[PDB]
Structure formats: C-alpha cells, structure tokens
Amino acid sequence: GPSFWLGNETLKVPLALFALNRQRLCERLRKNPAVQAGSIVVLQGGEETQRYCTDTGVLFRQESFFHWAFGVTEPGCYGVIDVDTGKSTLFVPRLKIHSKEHFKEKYAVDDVQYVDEIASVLTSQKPSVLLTLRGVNTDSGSVCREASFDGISKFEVNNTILHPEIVECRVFKTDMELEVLRYTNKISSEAHREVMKAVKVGMKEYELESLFEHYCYSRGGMRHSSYTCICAVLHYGHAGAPNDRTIQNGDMCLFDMGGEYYCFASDITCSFPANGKFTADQKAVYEAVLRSSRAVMGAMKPGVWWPDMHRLADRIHLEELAHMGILSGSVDAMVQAHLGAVFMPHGLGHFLGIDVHDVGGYPEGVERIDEPGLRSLRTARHLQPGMVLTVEPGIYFIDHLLDEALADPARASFLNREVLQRFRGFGRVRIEEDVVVTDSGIELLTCVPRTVEEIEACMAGCDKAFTP
Amino acid sequence: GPSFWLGNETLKVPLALFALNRQRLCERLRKNPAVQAGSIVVLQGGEETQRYCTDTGVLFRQESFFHWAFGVTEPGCYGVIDVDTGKSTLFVPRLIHSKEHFKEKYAVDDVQYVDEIASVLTSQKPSVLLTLRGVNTDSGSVCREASFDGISKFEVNNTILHPEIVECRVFKTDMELEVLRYTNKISSEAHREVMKAVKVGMKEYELESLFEHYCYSRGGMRHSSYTCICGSAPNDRTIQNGDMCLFDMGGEYYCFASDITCSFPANGKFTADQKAVYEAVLRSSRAVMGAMKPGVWWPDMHRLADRIHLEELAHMGILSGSVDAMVQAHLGAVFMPHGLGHFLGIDVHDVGGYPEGVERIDEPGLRSLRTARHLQPGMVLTVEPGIYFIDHLLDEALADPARASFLNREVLQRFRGFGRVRIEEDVVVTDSGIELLTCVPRTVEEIEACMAGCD
Ligand code: PRO
Ligand code: PRO
Ligand SMILES: [Mn+2]
Ligand SMILES: [Mn+2]
Ligand SMILES: [Mn+2]
Ligand SMILES: [Mn+2]
Ligand SMILES: [O-]
Numbered sequence: 001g002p003s004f005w006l007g008n009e010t011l012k013v014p015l016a017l018f019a020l021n022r023q024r025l026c027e028r029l030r031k032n033p034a035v036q037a038g039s040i041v042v043l044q045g046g047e048e049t050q051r052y053c054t055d056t057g058v059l060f061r062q063e064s065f066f067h068w069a070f071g072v073t074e075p076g077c078y079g080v081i082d083v084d085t086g087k088s089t090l091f092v093p094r095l096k097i098h099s100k101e102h103f104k105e106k107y108a109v110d111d112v113q114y115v116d117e118i119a120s121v122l123t124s125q126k127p128s129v130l131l132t133l134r135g136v137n138t139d140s141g142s143v144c145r146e147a148s149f150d151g152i153s154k155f156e157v158n159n160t161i162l163h164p165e166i167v168e169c170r171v172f173k174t175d176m177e178l179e180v181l182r183y184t185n186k187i188s189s190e191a192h193r194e195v196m197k198a199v200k201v202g203m204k205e206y207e208l209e210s211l212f213e214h215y216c217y218s219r220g221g222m223r224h225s226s227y228t229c230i231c232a233v234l235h236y237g238h239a240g241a242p243n244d245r246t247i248q249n250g251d252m253c254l255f256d257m258g259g260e261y262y263c264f265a266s267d268i269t270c271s272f273p274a275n276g277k278f279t280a281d282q283k284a285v286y287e288a289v290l291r292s293s294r295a296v297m298g299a300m301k302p303g304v305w306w307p308d309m310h311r312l313a314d315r316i317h318l319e320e321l322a323h324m325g326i327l328s329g330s331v332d333a334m335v336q337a338h339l340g341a342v343f344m345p346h347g348l349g350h351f352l353g354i355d356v357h358d359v360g361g362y363p364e365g366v367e368r369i370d371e372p373g374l375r376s377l378r379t380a381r382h383l384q385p386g387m388v389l390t391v392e393p394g395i396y397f398i399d400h401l402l403d404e405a406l407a408d409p410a411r412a413s414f415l416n417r418e419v420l421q422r423f424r425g426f427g428r429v430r431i432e433e434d435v436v437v438t439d440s441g442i443e444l445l446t447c448v449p450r451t452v453e454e455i456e457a458c459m460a461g462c463d464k465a466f467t468p
Numbered sequence: 469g470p471s472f473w474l475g476n477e478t479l480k481v482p483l484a485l486f487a488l489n490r491q492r493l494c495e496r497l498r499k500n501p502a503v504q505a506g507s508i509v510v511l512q513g514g515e516e517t518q519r520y521c522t523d524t525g526v527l528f529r530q531e532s533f534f535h536w537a538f539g540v541t542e543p544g545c546y547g548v549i550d551v552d553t554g555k556s557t558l559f560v561p562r563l564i565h566s567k568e569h570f571k572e573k574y575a576v577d578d579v580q581y582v583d584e585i586a587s588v589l590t591s592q593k594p595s596v597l598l599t600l601r602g603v604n605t606d607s608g609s610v611c612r613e614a615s616f617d618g619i620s621k622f623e624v625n626n627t628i629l630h631p632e633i634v635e636c637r638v639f640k641t642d643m644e645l646e647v648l649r650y651t652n653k654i655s656s657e658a659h660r661e662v663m664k665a666v667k668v669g670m671k672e673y674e675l676e677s678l679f680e681h682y683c684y685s686r687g688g689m690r691h692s693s694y695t696c697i698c699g700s701a702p703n704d705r706t707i708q709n710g711d712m713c714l715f716d717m718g719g720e721y722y723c724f725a726s727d728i729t730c731s732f733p734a735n736g737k738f739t740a741d742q743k744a745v746y747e748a749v750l751r752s753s754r755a756v757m758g759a760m761k762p763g764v765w766w767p768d769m770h771r772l773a774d775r776i777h778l779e780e781l782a783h784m785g786i787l788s789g790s791v792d793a794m795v796q797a798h799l800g801a802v803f804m805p806h807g808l809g810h811f812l813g814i815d816v817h818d819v820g821g822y823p824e825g826v827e828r829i830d831e832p833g834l835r836s837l838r839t840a841r842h843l844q845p846g847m848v849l850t851v852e853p854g855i856y857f858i859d860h861l862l863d864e865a866l867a868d869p870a871r872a873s874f875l876n877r878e879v880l881q882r883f884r885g886f887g888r889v890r891i892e893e894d895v896v897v898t899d900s901g902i903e904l905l906t907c908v909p910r911t912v913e914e915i916e917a918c919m920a921g922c923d
C-alpha cells in the first residue's frame with residue numbers, strides 16, 4: 001500500500017501502520033462491555049494556527065491521537081471509525097487542489113468526504129452513539145479537546161469510554177511503530193555523534209543545537225524537534241530561547257535533544273567533556289551514571305515495577321558518590337533519608353511515543369508516589385512488552401538542593417563538604433537512552449558512544465565503526 | 469546602556485530602541501484629542517503554549533506590539549506606559565532573578581510582579597487604561613486586549629491605541645533599521661549558500677534546512693520569520709534538471725523579520741525561456757525600486773510591474789496586441805496574482821497597510837495588495853514582482869473573450885509547467901528614493917557564476 005516518505009535515505013512508513021492502530025482500537029472497543037453496537041469514533045484533527053493576531057503561520061504539527069489513528073498531515077480534518085466494521089472515513093476541508101479520491105488513495109482509508117458534510121454523512125449512517133475524546137494528560141494537567149462540529153448536538157455523544165482505551169492502545173507499540181522509533185533514534189543518535197565531533201571550546205551552545213537540527217532535518221527529514229532541545233531559560237526566560245552560554249575548557253557538556261519523524265519522537269541525552277578529555281573527577285561522576293544506566297537496563301523486563309528501577313538508580317548513585325568521598329556513612333541510611341533525590345531530582349524515565357512524554361503513565365488505579373524523586377516519575381506502572389521508555393539517570397550538583405540537605409539534620413551528616421566543595425559548579429551528567437520492553441528484557445533503540453573511551457574516540461573523529 | 473546579543477558576530481541591539489518606541493508612541497498619543505490626561509497604556513505579553521493537551525512546549529515568540537514597546541523575551545509579562553510622563557513599568561511573573569535584574573536588563577523605569585498589577589495601577593490613579601484592540605488587515609484577526617484580575621474596576625478604552633501604535637510601527641527608527649539591515653545581511657548570505665549548494669536530485673527541504681542552519685548558527689536567528697517556501701510541512705519535491713527553483717525564506721533576529729526570494733535554474737544554467745521570464749521580473753523589480761520615493765502611490769508601482777511584465781511577455785510571443793488594452797483587461801493579474809509587496813518590520817506582513825481612510829482596490833492583482841498607501845520615508849517594504857504560469861488562471865483568461873485574444877496559445881503551451889519566478893528585495897524609503905537592504909546575486913551572469921562555484 002501507500003507509504004509516507006521524504007525520499008533520499010528517509011524511512012518509508014506504510015499507511016498500514018495507522019490502519020493497524022484503527023483495527024486495534026476497534027478490537028479493544030468491541031470487547032468493552034459498555035460500547036453500544038453501531039458506535040462511531042469521532043476524532044478532530046488539529047487546525048493551522050497563527051502568531052497571535054498576525055497572519056504569520058506557526059508550523060503545523062498534527063494532534064497526536066488523530067495522528068495515531070490516521071497519519072494525516074493536513075490541517076482542518078476530522079476522522080471517523082465505525083467500531084463494528086472498522087470502516088474509516090476521513091473528512092477533509094473543501095478548499096493544485098486534491099480530490100477526495102486523492103486523499104482516499106494517499107491514506108488508505110475506506111471513504112473521504114468534505115468537512116462541511118460531516119453532519120449529513122453521519123446522519124445518513126445512523127450511528128447509535130458518537131465516541132469522542134476527553135480526558136486528562138497526567139504530564140500537562142490539560143484536558144484533551146473533544147471533537148465538535150455544527151450539528152453534533154443532534155447526536156448522542158459519549159466522551160468517557162474512548163480516552164482510556166485509545167491511551168492504552170498508544171502505550172503498547174506495534175512492530176510497525178517500533179520501526180519508526182528505531183529510525184528516529186538512529187538519526188538522532190547520528191546527530192548526537194555529529195555534535196560530539198563538532199564541539200569546540202569557545203562555541204556557543206546554540207551553534208550545536210543548530211547543527212543537531214540541521215542533521216536531523218536535512219538527513220532525516222525531521223522537520224520538528226520532538227521537544228525543546230536542551231543545551232537558555234536563564235538569560236531569556238524559556239527553554240526555547242537560544243542557549244548562548246560560551247563553552248569553556250574544563251566544562252562538562254550535557255546535550256538533550258531528539259528529532260521527530262512523521263510525529264514519532266526520540267529523546268536522547270549525551271554528556272561529555274567540552275575539550276574531549278575526561279578529567280578524573282568527570283570520569284568518576286560520569287561512570288557513576290553509566291553504571292546506574294546499565295544496571296537499570298539490565299534489570300528491566302516485564303513485571304518490573306518502574307519505581308523500583310528509580311530506587312535502584314538512586315542506590316547506585318549514592319554508592320558511587322560515597323566511593324568518590326563526596327558522601328560518607330551508611331548507604332542504607334542515605335536511601336532511607338531519600339538522599340538520592342538531592343542528586344537526581346527528576347524521574348528515572350518516562351513513556352515515549354508520538355509524544356516525548358507519552359500518554360498513559362497514570363491510568364486509573366495507578367498512584368503517584370509522594371516521595372522525593374519518585375513524585376517526579378511520569379509513570380508508576382509495571383513494565384509490559386511493547387512499552388517504550390526512556391532510561392535517564394543523572395547526577396547533578398545543584399547548590400540550593402545541596403544547601404538544603406546541609407541544613408537538614410537528617411541528611412547533612414552524609415555530606416563531606418571538604419570533597420563536595422570541589423564539585424560545586426561541576427555541572428550535570430545525564431545519560432538518556434530510549435528502549436523497548438520486550439518479552440524478556442529490553443531492546444536498546446539508542447546508538448551513541450557511552451563509555452569514556454568511546455566518547456573520547458568519537459570526539460577525536462574516529463569512524464563510528466571503531467570500537468575501543 | 470544594556471543590549472541584546474547572542475555573541476560571536478551577532479548584532480548588539482540596544483534596549484534604547486524600545487525606549488525610543490515608547491517615547492514615540494506617547495508623543496503620538498499626547499497629540500490625540502480623545503486621549504485623556506493621566507491615561508496609561510496597558511500591554512499584555514505572550515505566554516508559553518503547549519501542543520494541544522500535551523506538555524510538549526511550543527517555541528515561544530513574543531507578541532509583536534509588546535516586543536515593539538519593550539523588547540522583552542520572557543513569557544507571562546505585562547508592560548504599561550504612563551502617557552503623560554512616558555514612565556515605563558514591566559510586570560514579571562513571580563516564580564530566579566530579582567525585579568532589579570529585569571529593570572537593569574530592559575532599562576525600564578520600574579519592575580513589579582504580575583500578581584500586583586491591579587494594586588500598582590490603582591495606586592497611580594489613572595483616568596483610563598488604553599488597551600490594544602483592532603483588526604489585522606492581513607489575517608482578519610482581532611488583536612487580543614490585555615486583561616488582568618481586577619481590570620473591571622478601571623475605566624478602559626480599547627479603540628484609541630491600536631491605530632496609533634500601528635502608525636508608529638509603520639515608520640522605522642534608525643535603530644530598528646540597523647536590525648533589519650542585519651537580518652537582511654544574514655538571510656542574504658544564507659540565500660547565497662543555498663544557491664551554491666543546490667544540486668539536481670536534492671530535496672527542497674534539504675536547502676530549507678541549510679538556510680535555517682546558516683541563520684541560526686551564524687546569525688543567532690532561532691526563528692524563520694515565516695514558513696519557508698521552497699519552490700521548484702517539508703517541501704519534499706525532488707529538484708529536477710530543467711527546473712526553475714524559487715526559494716522564499718527569511719530569518720528573524722530578536723523578533724525583527726526579513727523576507728527574501730531568489731529564483732534560479734536548478735542546474736545552474738538559464739535556458740532562453742527561463743532567461744526571458746527571469747529578466748522580465750528583474751526588469752520590473754529594478755523599475756519599481758528605481759521609481760520608489762516619498763509621494764509614490766503603491767498601487768501605481770503594482771501596475772508598473774504589470775505593464776512591464778505584459779511588455780516582456782508580448783516580446784516573447786506569449787502575448788500579442790496593445791499592452792494598453794491588456795492592462796485595461798487586467799491581464800497582468802493572470803501572471804502576477806498577488807500584491808507587488810508589503811510592509812515589513814516585526815511581522816513579515818507588517819501592520820498598518822490599511823488604516824482608516826485607505827481603501828483596498830477591488831481589481832484583480834490590486835485587491836491582493838497589503839497596502840494602498842503612498843510611500844513616506846521610514847517605511848520598509850518588500851518589492852516582489854513575479855511571473856507565474858498557473859493553469860487555472862490561464863484557463864480562465866482563455867475562456868474570457870476580453871482577454872483570450874491577447875494570448876498566443878501555441879506559445880503559451882510551451883510555458884505550461886514552466887513554474888514561476890519571483891524576485892523579492894527588502895527596501896527602505898528614504899527622503900529621495902530607497903535604500904536596498906537585500907544583497908544577493910540577481911543578474912543572470914551573477915547567478916550562473918555563483919552556482920558554478922566561482923570566486
Ligand atoms: O521531564 C523529564 O521527565 C526529564 C527530566 C530531565 C529532563 N527530562
Ligand atoms: O503574501 C504575499 O503578499 C507575498 C506574495 C506571495 C508570497 N508572499
Ligand atoms: Mn531528554
Ligand atoms: Mn526524557
Ligand atoms: Mn516572501
Ligand atoms: Mn513577502
Ligand atoms: O530527557
């Protein structure tokens with residue numbers, strides 16, 4: 001059948017991918033006892049937006065649930081799925097201008113109609129109930145926009161059934177979806193290598209962000225970054241602003257960037273010395289995060305409770321920080337005092353898919369854990385095959401977190417100021433891989449240099465094939 | 469005083485630019501007979517947005533009127549200006565920098581937190597708050613009026629400000645022109661790099677990518693001014709041998725735009741037909757720039773470009789008959805359906821093209837003009853004539869006996885799928901003529917030498 005493709009070396013994505021998602025959603029809804037016969041799923045695609053009151057266009061990016069179901073890149077559409085038969089209808093704006101037939105062929109749907117006819121067409125199809133999308137995103141706190149059209153009031157509308165079901169479908173990636181996520185990770189990994197090869201003392205961080213974006217777009221067809229790429233919030237107020245810090249000798253760099261292809265995300269972080277040679281201290285902190293990274297990846301398999309992996313990373317960080325002489329005392333005591341969250345205040349990792357922070361981390365019955373570090377986890381679910389997660393432990397030296405710990409009698413004793421003082425302004429190490437949960441373990445999607453020797457080799461311009 | 473700067477070779481933009489804008493706005497309001505003494509201008513800045521219901525951030529870009537007045541890059545702010553004294557107060561979110569930090573950074577008279585805006589304005593006992601509401605004549609959208617908790621307690625006027633701040637934006641200060649010269653410099657350089665890099669077989673988005681990379685990495689231009697048009701949402705058309713490329717792209721620096729279009733043969737060599745069409749647009753481009761000066765009516769420039777295009781198309785054999793008669797039948801709009809050019813500034817399609825008293829001309833071509841004003845010094849415009857071979861426009865003309873007679877179908881057939889040529893320059897009106905901001909290869913000889921890798 002047809003496939004989405006941007007030519008050259010970019011990935012051909014069969015539109016069958018979305019047909020399989022529609023099939024899976026219908027199969028789930030058919031097994032749902034509360035779904036009436038003759039129900040129709042109604043999704044509304046995104047519309048083009050402009051900057052405020054101007055006619056300056058904002059680059060259009062399809063709404064994620066609508067993309068997941070249909071793969072449609074055009075703004076202003078609606079999409080309908082008959083639950084009982086699986087029949088799909090795309091509604092496109094009545095505006096070279098393409099025919100309805102052109103869109104039917106392009107997207108391999110069963111029917112195409114114009115948007116202004118949606119009320120007439122649905123009336124004629126006599127559905128029992130329209131199933132629309134409404135629910136809460138547990139990362140943004142926002143409520144998903146329910147589809148609406150002139151005349152929808154004449155129909156029976158249920159806005160509670162669909163959201164948890166289509167979320168759960170998105171949580172489990174198909175083999176076709178994995179092929180795209182492998183590709184996004186391949187291009188983003190190559191871009192990360194290019195950045196490590198290009199970085200020079202004296203460069204502005206945004207020069208590297210630009211290079212990353214150029215690699216992803218020109219060689220990967222990735223028009224969008226998946227998320228705001230982190231290399232300043234400080235100097236200009238938003239993560240999106242150019243990071244205009246000058247890279248200095250002795251710096252540890254952290255680049256957190258990932259491109260998006262056809263609305264499938266990647267999210268990768270590399271940490272490395274600006275000048276291409278790890279100091280003893282840098283090697284020590286870095287290899288601590290490498291150790292937790294690898295321990296978690298080695299422990300992940302179906303049935304594993306994700307918060308247990310976060311705690312495992314914490315324990316390893318604390319062990320290694322103690323082996324460095326930054327911390328002293330009982331590691332068990334440190335864990336009881338939640339000392340790990342001083343060095344890693346964020347969650348270990350999160351679902352990834354069409355969204356960087358993908359849906360379904362906190363379905364009904366799954367509770368957020370009200371402890372330092374863990375409260376920042378974007379899911380507290382148990383791992384199952386088909387999930388895609390980031391694994392992103394880090395160690396940070398953040399003054400106000402350290403000072404707070406030093407002011408806390410329950411924590412302050414564990415800290416050796418004489419050694420710690422040398423790590424003030426050390427910076428940050430984070431190692432972020434993307435992985436798939438398999439039937440028995442994981443598959444690593446990311447492919448960047450990770451050991452000290454591999455990183456130093458990459459920055460010295462060694463061919464990627466070279467291995468130390 | 470302080471300046472915006474992204475280091476390396478990027479431009480230092482004095483925050484004094486925005487101070488001057490505020491003063492200019494107050495000077496204008498003070499002359500407005502409806503403006504009450506003790507009025508305060510209230511502007512609301514943009515806020516951070518996310519993609520739909522996700523936590524995926526959308527790259528923040530400041531609202532244009534608010535940027536013009538304050539140069540503030542942070543989301544979630546307000547800014548007010550005492551009309552009588554010119555005193556400026558910035559309101560920032562309480563979140564980490566001090567208010568003192570923001571005062572120093574933006575060279576405003578006072579900084580407060582946003583949650584105190586009602587209390588602060590109340591203490592200053594204004595007659596009325598002047599808020600922003602009006603219609604953008606390019607989008608049809610209504611400007612969003614500032615609002616805050618407790619604003620209901622104030623007398624608010626939302627009619628006075630818009631036309632007055634729009635009018636200020638129409639006329640660029642020397643400091644603004646410095647930034648627009650810079651954005652044109654970098655975008656010009658990026659266009660040259662694109663011309664050097666184009667190879668048959670490439671995808672258009674590869675050149676869009678290169679352009680953005682040059683502007684960002686070398687210019688500190690994070691944003692494209694507008695969605696990039698890459699003729700021959702990624703443009704994934706393969707550049708083919710024999711194609712005429714059209715690349716319309718411009719970077720933005722600190723919310724100051726640029727808008728440049730280059731047309732050139734994909735394979736680096738103009739055919740006779742391509743040279744003929746291209747040099748027709750070069751001729752109208754140069755004729756319009758030459759004729760521009762204070763007092764010139766912009767629609768006359770549009771019709772000048774039409775006349776020249778028709779003359780050249782007749783010379784080529786595409787058309788026959790009286791060019792006078794052709795103009796009377798609006799034949800120019802078949803080949804150039806859009807307006808000749810538009811105001812440019814903080815927005816690519818900048819404000820103020822149709823203030824009250826200036827009417828849109830209801831004729832083909834001219835109705836798409838984004839201004840029908842007379843030119844005055846300080847105005848910044850694009851000059852972007854083009855010739856297009858658009859089947860449905862051509863078909864409509866061939867069906868209409870008043871136009872069909874002028875067209876030589878046997879010659880036109882050859883130009884079906886020719887594509888299109890547009891040449892877009894950015895210029896400023898001076899006391900005597902114009903200053904050209906754009907600096908790219910333009911003659912056939914310059915373009916071919918550039919693409920051949922010469923120099
Ligand atoms: O938001 C999150 O979950 C991770 C934490 C570090 C940056 N991204
Ligand atoms: O919108 C305008 O007015 C010009 C002409 C077409 C491309 N930009
Ligand atoms: Mn990340
Ligand atoms: Mn992440
Ligand atoms: Mn343009
Ligand atoms: Mn333009
Ligand atoms: O991340």
Ligand SMILES: [O-]
Nearest residue numbers: 716727852892
């Ligand atoms: O343009």
